Design a protein around this ligand. Structure first.
Ligand SMILES: *[C@@H]1O[C@H](CO)[C@@H](O)[C@H](O)[C@H]1NC(C)=O
Lengths: 48, 49, 49, 41
């Protein structure tokens, strides 16, 4: 049960933004220029 | 619109203008008005004038 | 002004669609919804909205 | 004129289809066992 709970928390953490506009970085990359996309991507990477 | 080469300012905020043709949106608004030249910069978020 | 909300997209980026291939590892973007995977006919039911 | 609303008045807060989950969402709903009117006509 402990292993399952930890793994479920880890997988749920992929649904957060950590301050970026969107949780999924596919959308970030699909509607932003790389110089401006990298700003969001940095926050998302730190959060993960 | 991007390649019209006749628009003084075209800056986008949420998106990238070059990638804009590839997106897909729920709905879009369109406002139109006439202003002078020295307050176009006032049309921006977090701006006072 | 654009927006990203839960209702299905109405005004969308104009570019030619294609066919769809199943049971293959392909890249796709369903009217904005972009991803990569194996497209397979499903057995679940969707409320028609 | 004043009847009690039982466990009733809940809608689908979104469209993302889900099955066999226990999804939680904060939105506007009828509180369970609320004091509702009985306008008679
Ligand atoms: C609903 O409101 C009325 C207002 O007078 C009150 O008399 C009644 O007791 C309330 N219902 C319940 C279940 O308390």
């Amino acid at each position: 049960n402990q292993n399952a709970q930890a793994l479920n928390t880890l997988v749920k953490q992929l649904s957060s933004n950590f301050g970026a506009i969107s949780s999924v970085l596919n959308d970030i990359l699909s509607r932003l220029d790389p110089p401006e996309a990298e700003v969001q991507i940095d926050r998302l990477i730190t959060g993960r | 619109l991007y390649n019209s080469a006749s628009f003084s300012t075209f800056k986008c905020y949420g998106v990238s203008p070059t990638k804009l043709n590839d997106l897909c949106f729920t709905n879009v608004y369109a406002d139109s008005f006439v202003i002078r030249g020295d307050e176009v910069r006032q049309i921006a978020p977090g701006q006072t004038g | 002004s654009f927006e990203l909300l839960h209702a299905p997209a109405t005004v969308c980026g104009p570019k030619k669609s294609t066919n769809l291939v199943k049971n293959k590892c392909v890249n796709f973007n369903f009217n904005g919804l972009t991803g990569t995977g194996v497209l397979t006919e499903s057995n679940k039911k969707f409320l028609p909205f | 004129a004043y009847t009690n609303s039982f466990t009733r008045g809940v809608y689908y807060p979104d469209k993302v289809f889900r099955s066999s989950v226990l999804h939680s969402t904060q939105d506007l709903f009828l509180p369970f066992f609320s004091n509702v009117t009985w306008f008679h006509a």
